[PDB]
Design a protein around this ligand. Sequence first.
Ligand SMILES: *[C@@H]1O[C@H](CO)[C@@H](O[C@@H]2O[C@H](CO)[C@@H](O)[C@H](O)[C@H]2NC(C)=O)[C@H](O)[C@H]1NC(C)=O
Ligand SMILES: *[C@H]1O[C@H](CO)[C@@H](O)[C@H](O)[C@H]1NC(C)=O
Ligand SMILES: *[C@H]1O[C@H](CO)[C@@H](O)[C@H](O)[C@H]1NC(C)=O
Ligand SMILES: [Ca+2]
Ligand SMILES: [Cu+2]
Ligand SMILES: [Cu+2]
Lengths: 631, 630
Amino acid sequence: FQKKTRHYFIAAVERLWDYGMSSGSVPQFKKVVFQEFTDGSFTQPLYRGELNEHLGLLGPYIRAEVEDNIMVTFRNQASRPYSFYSSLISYEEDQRQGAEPRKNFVKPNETKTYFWKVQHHMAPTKDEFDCKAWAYFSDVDLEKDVHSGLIGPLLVCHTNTLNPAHGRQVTVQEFALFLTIFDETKSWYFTENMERNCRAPCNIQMEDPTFKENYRFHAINGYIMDTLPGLVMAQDQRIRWYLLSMGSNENIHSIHFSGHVFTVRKKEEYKMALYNLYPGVFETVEMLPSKAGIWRVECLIGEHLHAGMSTLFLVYSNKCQTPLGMASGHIRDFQITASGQYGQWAPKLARLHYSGSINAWSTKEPFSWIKVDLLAPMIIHGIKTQGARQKFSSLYISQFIIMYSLDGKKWQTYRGNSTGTLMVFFGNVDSSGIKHNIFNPPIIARYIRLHPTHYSIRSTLRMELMGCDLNSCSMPLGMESKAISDAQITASSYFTNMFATWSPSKARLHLQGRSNAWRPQVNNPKEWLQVDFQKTMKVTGVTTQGVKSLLTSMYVKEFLISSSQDGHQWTLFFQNGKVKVFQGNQDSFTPVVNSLDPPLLTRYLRIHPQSWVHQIALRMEVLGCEAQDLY
Amino acid sequence: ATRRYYLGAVELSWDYVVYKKTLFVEFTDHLFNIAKPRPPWMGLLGPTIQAEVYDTVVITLKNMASHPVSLHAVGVSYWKASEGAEYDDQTSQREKEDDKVFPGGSHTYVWQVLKENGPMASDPLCLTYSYLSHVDLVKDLNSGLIGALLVCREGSLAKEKTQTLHKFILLFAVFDEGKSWHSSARAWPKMHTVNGYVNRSLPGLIGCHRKSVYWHVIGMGTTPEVHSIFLEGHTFLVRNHRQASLEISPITFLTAQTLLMDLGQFLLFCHISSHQHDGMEAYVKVDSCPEEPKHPKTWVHYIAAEEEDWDYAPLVLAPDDRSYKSQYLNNGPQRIGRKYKKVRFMAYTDETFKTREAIQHESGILGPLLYGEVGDTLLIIFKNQASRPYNIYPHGITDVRPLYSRRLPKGVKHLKDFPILPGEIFKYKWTVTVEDGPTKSDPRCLTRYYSSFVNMERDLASGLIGPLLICYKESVDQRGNQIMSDKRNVILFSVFDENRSWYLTENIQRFLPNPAGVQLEDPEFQASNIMHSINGYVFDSLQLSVCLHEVAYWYILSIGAQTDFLSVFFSGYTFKHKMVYEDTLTLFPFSGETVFMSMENPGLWILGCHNSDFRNRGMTALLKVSSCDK
Ligand SMILES: *[C@@H]1O[C@H](CO)[C@@H](O[C@@H]2O[C@H](CO)[C@@H](O)[C@H](O)[C@H]2NC(C)=O)[C@H](O)[C@H]1NC(C)=O
Ligand SMILES: *[C@H]1O[C@H](CO)[C@@H](O)[C@H](O)[C@H]1NC(C)=O
Ligand SMILES: *[C@H]1O[C@H](CO)[C@@H](O)[C@H](O)[C@H]1NC(C)=O
Ligand SMILES: [Ca+2]
Ligand SMILES: [Cu+2]
Ligand SMILES: [Cu+2]
């Protein structure tokens, strides 16, 4: 086992503070930040990857093991000269000097490079956690250069805890949180007051009730409206939080995570619900967020919450993963706007498995792409990609990058875990190369673009998408797997003779047999089918289908639904007006992505067939999970 | 088991003749019928609700108020069909209705303790947690919605049906009636105090004497407003990390315990200058009981209290009107390096109080370094040699009695009271026992101090300070006693407020030239004597000499500089306080804490404090490091 000398080519720049969410007069701000670069030629901005964009308005992670080497080759690009500084900044020896100028001063465009053994001084212990947390900042003016914007995180780890894959991850997933209350009586703000907000309509409020950051700034980074971005995590892979409060002498912040609890180490490990962060106390704490769905972090301190801490975080299950609907989707959903053409057109028809000669996407275009409006912010875990087949020609796409938009306006590229600059994806190899790609960290988007990086004869594609809703649990409730017993379903009545028993206990999304579905004794609209969950459930929607009776076709064309808590009296389903006329089947086979506007919370679900084909015939399935149990 | 708590929330009128709120009721309803546990310690408190590791609690709140009011937990898990917290957690129709109980509503509550939120292997038998209400966090609170919520291991219903425990919930809380539900003319809204028991108000009950009493203590407020709480006996649970005085901030709860002596209803401070006047108080009647139907050292100190002169900034001086530092000292004419007349403790050789004790020009103003391990006895023989009379009391030990007798100076209720005039000498006995010393957890030497107590700071501020060290047992045995135990060294973070000093205008006829305009009480002049310093030395005035590879403990405290706390600095250096490694020490105004440090970073280091609004008002020193010899 070895030691490593890990440099970090890092600098200090500016841009600053955006708000635009929903909650336009918005102000420009021009504070300073740290920024990680690519090498000594300080060029590549080093795109902030999906895995660490929570970091956002502060500096990049600097990381080391025990018996290690830390190095910083630093360039300043700004007005007021700044500097790197933390605790273990173990300088060395002595000099022919005048009372020891040990002053660290980094003038603009000059390069001050420093590097030092990171002794067990900075290390966490056998009593402690897999990693401790430390701050770096500019010490030119520790007072101002903190409201200015040179907050930075530093991680010091046990030996054999990091990776080739950069950073750590042995059931890890880390996040830093940077709670200050920024203020601009600090750092060059003069070049803001009369830079923006003022021209010939000026001379309004000098320092009287104007307080422009006690008008706003209550940081959890500086994406701290009442919403900052990158809090993505798997509802198990137990997450370590790096809480470091900074600022002034009112900057106590007492943070917690609703409906979650975490453990802190010290002497031992003892369990806690919220932590009075202090200025200068760099907390590490871990938790196992075993409650799925969508939550938030808030500094519980009354007046702090009410001007910017209610800042969301999301937990998904990864036991949720259904095809997002490319067979079961949207007849001719979305495609492109010029990228894509060849008679036998683009999507319109670029789905996975689509049989025929006129089948899939098709463009001899060096600059190409396709676009899917998922019609809602969605979790996308992966993408099954495949190719087509020509005259006698094997043609497919061999390489691709994946961009996404959550909004439609500002896009960007992708950086699946710790890759490089840009996440290069490997295509197919033939005309049936189903190369199910998974998104290492997931993606939350509404739009996805696929861009070819090499093709066969034409940039040629057919594809499906993996994922599901934030957690509207788009996962089969148990009709298919038969987690719901044959006992657990009755119907209004069942057809039965000798050569058949089309009992309710058969209504199953794909079921073969002689009597392979549910059928009512006779045909009435006031006829129904009833699932009983032996507990209280949440529902996305019911997947319907008909039967192949070897006789003739049989399926249900339109239906209604009813809900109950008691299981003996029924409050049925509604639109925004009258009852919901449900868009049902049209064949012996083929299922129906038929879901519900208000997710229905119930335990007794009844299907109400309205219009049908030849007889009323049902093979089906429910999608969902469960909230609380009954009460 | 499966627990239910059918209790809604109400509007009530409050008192101890000023101020009426909205509370958190207690009642057995299906409608609106009386039901009360509250008599004693229960102030404004939704009933202390208790659930064990594996259980499932069902609060159903019936709302009655002009208020839209919620119910929201902490330390517990639940479904997005509770939480009781409005904001877009995506939440379908019925999943948001928990988030805000529309005024005069009604809603059920789904609460779970899993294994993952029960209390850790080794810590508090039973965890401190509260139950809030948040629609408008600021409003819902200051108004008066808060209750206690406890959670702990498999056995309350079964091992408190058979076990005896003395436990209360003390709600250290600061409601501000200007931030209430509520909104010529001269008298705008106010309060600030414990359990809801104002000013000096007292609540209710006590616990038995010969054993221990546990309190789940819930910190409160709607602002960053720190406290520091005391009474007699040590308050040793934090973990079994063993603490001088419960120290409470914004929103805080961990849970702590103490022992007892007898009936003496013990005094209950918030003990800070600002919070004081409008402060928190309560008693404790410690009564008799229902349930019965290489040895120890002997230390010696001859100390005198004695008047001298103090130059806060001798070594370095460079003033005019040239700075904020230029302004300091005597805001008339005189204003250079700053000289005042102080009265600091100083020890002598023997009863013949003659031989000057060679001083420690690093401890500046500080008293002689007092030390005594568990088991020892301090015979502290004390002369006043300053006109305006004072005494000596150690914040630390509890067995402090005049040497020879168990008398009380002919008249007073206890020694930190009135005794010792100019001239006269008193022989005091300080006996130190295991209870006031460290433990198998702490450091081995907790940090404490002695003030004088004839006046509080109208004493202290004028110079009456000295470091008291209480320690674990050891002598050529125990741990770390084979070649040497490297010396003891103290830093004291102190703002001296000359503006209060018992040498007030004495000092103005002195250093200040002419009182020919005898001006007093002023904007800038009052600020001109608030002396933020470390050991009297200020503005990088006498730093400290040390060297590299050298290694020993620092003992540090905050005294006199109150109203606020101190995060404390040390450039490039890092310490092992509480056997973790942190780089900054947060310090209250009680604040006794004990760090440890491997000195091996050669150079100038700007020791000060992590707060950059005093370290400019002075409040910094330097430290030097370079190889030695031996
Ligand atoms: C208890 O509260 C009352 C509230 O009025 C305090 O009374 C006055 O407080 C003002 C503060 O502006 C002071 O100027 C006076 O000392 C008080 N005047 C009166 C009329 O008594 C009172 O100080 C509090 N009691 C305590 C613990 O001292
Ligand atoms: C180098 O950096 C600083 C940034 O403010 C500035 O002084 C100077 O203009 C820069 N040099 C260039 C781009 O010529
Ligand atoms: C990428 O990072 C995530 C983070 O937890 C991890 O789960 C995944 O295994 C990593 N990808 C690889 C190396 O397959
Ligand atoms: Ca909710
Ligand atoms: Cu806060
Ligand atoms: Cu107080």
